[PDB]
């Protein structure tokens, strides 16, 4: 373990120094070989000497002195708009004091502790000391100095010497401790003149020395880890944070609750590390702690006590107790001094001494007045004034290395991070390769005739898209590494711009690999121009396109906070760019209001360049001459003409240049200009991204058990976890259950309540009044978990009412349930915040309120037998733990039987329990019985069986733990299990259990048939309640429904008004088909938005509501499925109204007088599409754990469905292999139904550019020459007054609809098929969730 720089640590440092000085080999106190060499002096000298000393003033230590310091500071979805308007009006155009006058001085090498109750201003004080005043202001009368410097000097020039870090250890999970510390050592090492010593080896030696100092040498080559990623222990992560902070050159270090959620054995090591840093490296550590042990308190040098923002004492930690006792306060026996000082601000505690009850401060003002009047304050003020006088009498860039060095080190660290977790690049490259192969399969081997003119247009449109979004997932790397970048900026290590540049540079190999793997396959599987130069130009254009898109995505993400948050507004922009690339709406078809968008579209130029490269200067063999068929068997080719935009009469080949000029209006003079435009766009977006990164940042029945033995299978070997345990509980008694780490107290608690998912019971038996456990036991107990798992939107009253309704017997009327909920609220003292939203931990109920709500949720269910509590007091400050203990005592007084597991309690807390069950290592009970007054009886047990007498001022818990040798460094005289087995107290317990079993059995039973039911409420009631709760939670979510509405409305309006009043020419029909195709894009964003709110509900249900048997899994999954339907239906209605009418599709129904039926069918189709989106998202999420994986799988399946939906290529051109994917596609039928409903049964009028000139034979007219063909195939013609006929190949939209395999007579059937698919999804969900999650 860590014992704070013992002799062997000095030996290790001496060996390291010997190795370092021998490596560079190729006074007495600094020679590792010479005797009388002290590691402390070597470590101190390493930082200053053995490196060049810049002429700039750089302090090696800091201390802060200040006087007169004062700091002060100033919903559903319907009302969200009103709240936003009010907030904006407030933005357009009293004082609540936090910290009152304070005076203090902290010198280097002294560890300081800020004591006080929560909300007393300790965190604010430590923020002020660390020049972190953001969010409030300090008074102008306050005199603050840092060894003669100024707060603004520290803020701007000397940033990084003073650091603040409170509760979150932000590290890279997959980076080893050695690498993490080497990075800081390298970045903090000055360069200047490196002659005489290598910088790399010096940094390595410094990192190794600091690892040795903080006892982290054994953690080298081990991943730092995280709460999710496994790595070093939680107590080692804190020491890693300390080592990194001290290695970067921080002198003043402020921590708030950095030890929160740590056991005493590890909090003590944290304080020991802080003390070691203070004494060896002359740092100034300040810590704000709420649960401090006596051993930890013995390490503090100075203490500052805060009472509602008033500093009531500052001085040596060994004199606070005497000062406050002289004030007239009595310290209760067996109370740690830290707890005494903290409780001296609690009216419930803080009992005055006898005779001092009349003259003692009672309010914060009186305490402050006493402190000011005391001689200690006078001495402190004199010392601070002298320090100020001494300081008065006697670097633009806080960073150390140059920008190039910062970029280089960032690139190296990013490469190391990729090496540690190489899953993402490999997955991205393989996905790109596979999806490019699949996409090229449909476009395989495009022919050389004009029949490919469309497909060659589509392929090049989908190549660019594939290159555009290939780097979309890299944005994730921005969000993961953001907190670490902010921390290292606050440490004055490197700038955010340097990290951005390093991130851009590091993924260039990945970008190149993806580009090669996709383009090389695609350009050749899809038959494009085979010229090597053409391929290389295409590759260059794709490379520049992907650079532009990557920079744009990075710019968008630099000002975001979440993937869905960035995708909601960015989806509209990306859809607009995709639409105006130049293929969906060719330039001739673009409207006047939107022709400007194409000018500022970075992808339109790429598409134009690629199309020019492929088509210009190319001749395509004609595939279909318009006059042909049975009536035209032998005619001259002079009369015929090709069916293409640029076709020339009498020509057997069509030139690519004419087709490009006519259809798209692309020209070869723009082939290279577009490259320059794209390069300029890339540079502009890169500059914007860097600028944003730099700037935009910042109970009659009795339950007992006998001989309970419990074993589990570990490494294919049986292990005994519980060894013949026995005991009981009785109404009105609290039975603490304690033991060592390996005592298995938690295992005993879980096994008693039947919450263990493994193991078997061998010898024991659990009884209720002597009767075995029936099926009604699980519903006759309450269980309060350590963690508080509640929905963030439900109110306290609603949270209690849900449980009361779903867990109480049905015969009880709703009024009785509400009355009991009110009674429980009154009992637990929640009337003040009965209607308050639970909210998140940071904003909402505090820890005590959340724990009270957790207890109440179980109480309202009316447990009849027992109330298990899993560590109720753990993870709470002394006062909140005291309050919870008093609440438990009150509950016991009311007739409840309580059995609680207790971990590391204080003497006062332990004195409140009625009975104790103490477990040794291996589940062996050492003591079971009443602990008497002040734990006296328990003390009277061990002392009477050969144990050292308990100290008069020691905590009984710690003493009894160390008597049995459980505590580290403690020696047990003998195993106390055998002592307990034959002690005349085990005999009493056995006799009592036997008497209870023999006697209580005679009592008449209370056999209630409803008790023997798995769930209290019927299935339909559970389903209805769960669905309504989910609907309300979605409605009250802050910005979810509005996000969906905004995304859908914007996308639908843009799509509708891009094709506003679309004309029915030959190109207009294709444009409208691709409009329908693009109507489905918001699928991915909707799924991503919706999944997290399913994650939250699933977590809440499975963690707590599943074992409690509140409702069945079916009522959960069906409720989740039903919750989303109404919102999707409303969204689909809005989208249909925003898209159908702007396109003017109703005009296609006027000729046949079928406006209403077709409109109704289209509305149903759109709403069904949205419902299908929701069902598919839920299906893909059912069997997966993480939401990101479910979203990715849904996107992949949607892409596969869209590829083979019949738009890009019909079944005739699709390879026979993929035909099944064309039939099993839910989207083929949807697209066919939509197209047939919106386009069928109307006329077609060709545009001027689409008419093909036909020269009739000499001595013939247009009609007499073209009528037989018109009878064969549709179309019409016009006379151009020149002798030629302008022919249009299509006269009715039915021809195009048949070309796309869409029929107007099969719309309804198609619709039905789509509905079937929706049904399937739902069914699959209800099955998959059972297979993957239900146990
Ligand atoms: C960290 C960032 C990393 C980014 C990656 C870095 C990338 C840097 C690359 C720098 C390389 C720059 C090369 C520029 C030199 C162009 C010289 C041709 C200029 C020209 O102009 O060549 C026109 C004809 C086609 O022209 P065309 O068929 O469309 O029409 C004309 C005819 O070519 C004809 O020649 C007559 O014109 P000229 O006599 O030439 O003036 C007239 O004929 P007609 O009008 O009567 O038909 C017409 O103008 O190019 C052709 O064939 C094919 C010729 C190769 C096309 C580009 C070269 C390939 C790129 C290099 C490598 C690709 C990426 C590199 C690796 C990627 C990742 C590692
Ligand atoms: O990524 C695609 C293009 N694509 C890639 N392989 C096959 N088609 C598919 N896609 C992704 N989500 C939905 N469809 C795309 C990207 C953006 C876009 F606007 C359309 C579009 F088809």
Swiss-Prot record:
Binding annotation for ATP: 739-746
Regulation of catalytic or functional activity: Disulfiram reverses CDR1-mediated drug resistance by interaction with both ATP and substrate-binding sites of the transporter and may be useful for antifungal therapy.
Coiled-coil segments on the chain, per record: 981-1008
Keyword Transport included in the entry's annotation: yes
Outcome following mutation: residue 572 to A: Leads to general drug-sensitivity
Extracellular side: 445-458, 529-532, 586-674, 1061-1073, 1146-1158, 1221-1310
Resulting phenotype, residue 574 to A: Leads to selective drug-sensitivity
Pfam family for this entry, one: ABC_trans_N
Resulting phenotype, residue 122 to A: Impairs NBD-mediated ATP hydrolysis
Mutagenesis / variant outcome for changing residue 1293 to A: Leads to selective drug-sensitivity
Result of altering residue 1180 to A: Leads to reduced drug efflux and ATPase activity
Annotated localization: Cell membrane
Effect of substituting residue 568 to A: Leads to general drug-sensitivity
Effect of residue 161 to K: Leads to general drug-sensitivity
Record-annotated membrane-spanning stretches: 424-444, 459-479, 508-528, 533-553, 565-585, 675-695, 1040-1060, 1074-1094, 1125-1145, 1159-1179, 1200-1220, 1311-1331
Record has Nucleotide-binding as a keyword: yes
Positions on the Cytoplasmic side per record topology: 1-423, 480-507, 554-564, 696-1039, 1095-1124, 1180-1199
Membrane topology of the entry: Multi-pass membrane protein
Reported impact of residue 1175 to A: Leads to selective drug-sensitivity
One GO term describing the cellular component: plasma membrane
Stated role: Pleiotropic ABC efflux transporter that confers resistance to numerous chemicals including anisomycin, cycloheximide, fluconazole, miconazole, ketoconazole, itriconazole, nystatin, terbinafine, amorolfine, brefeldin A, amphotericin B, fluphenazine, as well as estrogen. Plays a role in farnesol-induced apoptotic process through glutathione efflux activity. Mediates in-to-out translocation of membrane phospholipids including aminophospholipids and thus regulates asymmetric distribution of phosphatidylethanolamine. Exhibits nucleoside triphosphatase activity.
Swiss-Prot/TrEMBL domain comment: Contains 2 cytoplasmic nucleotide binding domains (NBDs). The N-terminal NBD has ATPase activity. The 2 NBDs are asymmetric and non-exchangeable and the drug efflux by CDR1 involves complex interactions between the two halves of the protein.
Protein name in UniProt: Pleiotropic ABC efflux transporter of multiple drugs CDR1
């Amino acid at each position: 373990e860590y014992h704070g720089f013992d002799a062997h640590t000095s030996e290790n440092i001496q060996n390291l120094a010997r190795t370092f000085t021998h490596d560079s080999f190729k006074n007495d106190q600094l020679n590792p070989d010479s005797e009388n060499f002290n590691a402390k002096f070597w470590v101190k000298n390493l930082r200053k000497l053995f490196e060049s000393d810049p002429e700039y003033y750089k302090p090696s230590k800091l201390g802060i002195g200040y006087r007169n310091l004062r700091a002060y500071g100033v919903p559903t979805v319907t009302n969200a708009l009103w709240k936003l308007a009010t907030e904006g009006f407030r933005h357009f155009q009293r004082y609540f004091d936090i910290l009152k006058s304070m005076d203090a001085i902290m010198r280097p090498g002294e560890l300081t502790v800020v004591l006080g109750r929560p909300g007393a201003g300790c965190s604010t004080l430590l923020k002020t000391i660390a020049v972190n005043t953001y969010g409030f202001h300090i008074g102008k009368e306050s005199q603050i100095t840092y060894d003669g410097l100024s707060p603004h000097d520290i803020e701007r020039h000397y940033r990084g010497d003073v650091i603040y870090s409170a509760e979150t250890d932000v590290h890279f999970p997959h980076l080893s401790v050695g690498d993490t510390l080497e990075f800081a050592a390298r970045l903090r090492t000055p360069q200047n003149r490196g002659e005489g010593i290598d910088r790399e080896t010096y940094a390595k030696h410094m990192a190794s020395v600091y690892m040795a100092t903080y006892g982290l040498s054994h953690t080298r080559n081990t991943n730092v880890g995280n709460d999710f990623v496994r790595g070093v222990s939680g107590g080692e992560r804190k020491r890693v944070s300390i080592a990194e902070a001290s290695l970067s050159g921080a002198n003043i270090q402020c921590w708030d609750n950095a030890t929160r959620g740590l056991d005493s054995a590890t909090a003590l090591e944290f304080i020991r590390a802080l003390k070691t840093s203070a004494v060896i490296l002359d740092t100034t550590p300040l810590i704000a702690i709420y649960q401090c042990s006596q051993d930890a308190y013995d390490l503090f040098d100075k203490v500052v006590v805060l009472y509602e923002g008033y500093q009531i004492f500052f001085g040596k930690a060994t004199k606070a107790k005497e000062y406050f006792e002289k004030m007239g306060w009595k310290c209760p026996q067996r109370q740690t001094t830290a707890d005494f000082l903290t409780s001296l601000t609690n009216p419930a505690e803080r009992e005055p001494l006898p005779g001092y009850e009349d003259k003692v401060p009672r309010t914060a003002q009186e305490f402050e007045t006493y402190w000011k009047n005391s001689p200690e304050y006078a001495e402190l003020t004199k010392e601070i004034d002298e320090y100020f006088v001494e300081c008065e009498r006697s670097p633009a860039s806080p960073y150390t290395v140059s920008f190039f060095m910062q970029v280089r080190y960032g690139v190296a660290r990013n490469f190391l991070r990729m090496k540690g977790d190489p899953s993402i690049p490999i997955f991205s490259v393989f996905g790109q390769l596979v999806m490019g192969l699949i996409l090229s399969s449909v476009f395989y081997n495009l022919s050389q005739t004009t029949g490919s003119f469309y497909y060659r247009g589509a392929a090049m449109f989908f190549a660019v898209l594939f290159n555009a979004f290939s780097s979309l997932l890299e944005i994730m790397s921005l969000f993961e590494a953001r907190p670490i970048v902010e921390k290292h900026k606050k440490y004055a290590l490197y700038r955010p711009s340097a990290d951005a540049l390093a991130s851009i540079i590091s993924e260039l190999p990945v970008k190149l690999a993806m580009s090669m793997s996709f383009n090389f396959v695609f350009y050749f599987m899809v038959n494009f121009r085979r010229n090597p130069g053409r391929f290389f130009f295409y590759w260059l254009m794709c490379i520049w396109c992907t650079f532009v898109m990557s920079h744009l995505f990075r710019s968008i993400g630099a000002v975001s906070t979440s993937i869905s948050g960035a995708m909601t507004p960015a989806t509209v922009l990306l859809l607009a760019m995709v639409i105006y690339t130049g293929f969906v709406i060719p330039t001739p078809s673009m409207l006047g209001w939107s022709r400007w968008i194409n000018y500022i579209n970075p992808v339109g130029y790429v598409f134009e360049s690629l199309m020019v490269n492929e088509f210009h200067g190319r001749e395509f063999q004609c595939a279909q001459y318009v006059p042909s068929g049975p009536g035209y068997e032998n005619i001259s080719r002079s009369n015929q003409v090709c069916t293409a935009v640029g076709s020339v009469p009498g020509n057997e080949m069509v030139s690519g240049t004419n087709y490009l000029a006519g259809a798209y209006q692309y020209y070869n003079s723009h082939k290279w200009r577009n490259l320059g435009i794209t390069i300029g766009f890339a540079v502009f977006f890169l500059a914007i991204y860097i600028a944003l990164t730099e700037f935009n940042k910042g109970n009659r029945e009795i339950f007992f058990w006998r001989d309970l033995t419990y074993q589990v299978k570990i490494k294919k070997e049986d292990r005994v976890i519980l060894d013949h345990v026995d005991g009981w509980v009785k109404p009105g008694q609290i039975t603490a259950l304690m033991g060592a780490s390996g005592a298995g107290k938690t295992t005993l608690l879980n096994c008693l309540s039947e919450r263990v998912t493994t193991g078997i019971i061998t010898d024991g038996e659990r009884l209720v009044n002597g009767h075995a456990l029936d099926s009604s036991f699980q519903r006759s107990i309450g269980y309060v978990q350590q963690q508080d798992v509640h929905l963030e939107t439900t109110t306290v009253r609603e949270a209690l009412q849900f449980s009361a309704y779903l867990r109480q017997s049905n015969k009880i009327s709703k009024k009785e349930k509400d009355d009991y909920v009110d009674y429980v609220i009154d009992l637990l003292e929640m009337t003040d915040y009965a209607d308050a939203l639970v909210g998140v931990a940071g904003e909402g109920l505090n820890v005590e309120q959340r724990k009270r709500l957790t207890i109440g949720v179980e109480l309202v269910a009316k447990p009849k037998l027992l109330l298990f509590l899993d560590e109720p007091t753990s993870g709470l400050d002394s006062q909140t733990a005291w309050s919870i203990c008093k609440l438990m005592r009150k509950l016991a007084d009311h007739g409840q039987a309580i059995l609680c597991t207790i971990h590391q309690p204080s003497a006062l807390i332990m004195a409140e329990f009625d009975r104790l069950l103490f477990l040794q290592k291996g589940g062996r009970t050492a003591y079971f019985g009443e602990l008497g007054e002040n734990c006296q009886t328990m003390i009277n047990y061990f002392e009477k069986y050969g144990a050292d007498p308990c100290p008069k001022e020691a905590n009984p818990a710690e003493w009894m733990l160390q008597v049995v040798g459980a505590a580290p460094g403690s020696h047990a005289k003998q195993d106390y299990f055998e002592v307990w087995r034959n002690s005349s107290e085990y005999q009493a317990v056995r006799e009592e259990i036997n008497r209870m079993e023999a006697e209580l059995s005679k009592l008449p039973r209370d056999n209630d048939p409803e008790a023997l039911l798995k769930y209290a409420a019927p299935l339909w009631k559970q389903y209805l309640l769960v669905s309504w709760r989910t609907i309300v939670q979605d409605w009250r979510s802050p910005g979810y429904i509005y996000s969906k509405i905004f995304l859908v409305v914007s996308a639908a309006l843009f799509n509708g008004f891009s094709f506003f009043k679309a004309k029915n020419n030959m190109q207009g029909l294709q444009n409208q088909m691709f409009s329908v195709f693009m109507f489905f894009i918001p699928f991915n964003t909707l799924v991503q938005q919706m999944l997290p709110y399913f994650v939250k509900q699933r977590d809440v249900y499975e963690v707590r509501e599943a074992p409690s048997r509140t409702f069945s899994w079916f009522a959960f999954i069906a409720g989740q499925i039903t919750s989303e339907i109404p919102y999707q239906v409303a969204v689909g209605t809005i989208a249909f109204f925003c898209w159908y009418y702007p396109l003017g599709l109703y005009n296609n129904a006027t000729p046949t007088d079928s406006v209403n039926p077709r409109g109704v069918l289209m509305w149903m189709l759109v709403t069904a599409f949205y419902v299908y989106t929701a069902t598919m998202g839920q299906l893909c999420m059912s069997f997966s754990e993480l939401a990101d994986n479910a979203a990715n799988l849904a996107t992949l399946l949607f892409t596969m469905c869209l590829n083979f939906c019949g738009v890009l290529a019909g079944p005739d051109v699709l390879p026979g292999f993929w035909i099944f994917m064309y039939r099993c596609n839910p989207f083929t039928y949807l697209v066919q139904a939509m197209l047939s409903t919106g386009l069928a049964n109307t006329f077609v009028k060709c545009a001027e550019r689409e008419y093909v000139s036909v020269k009739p034979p000499n001595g013939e007219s247009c009609s007499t020459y073209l009528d037989p063909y018109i009878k064969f195939a549709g179309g019409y013609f016009e006379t151009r007054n020149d002798g030629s006929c302008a022919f249009c190949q299509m006269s009715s939209t039915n021809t195009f609809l048949k070309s796309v395999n869409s029929l107007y007579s099969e719309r309804w059937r198609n619709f039905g098929i789509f509905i079937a698919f929706i049904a399937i999804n739902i069914i699959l969900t209800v099955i998959f969730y059972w297979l993957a999650r239900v146990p």
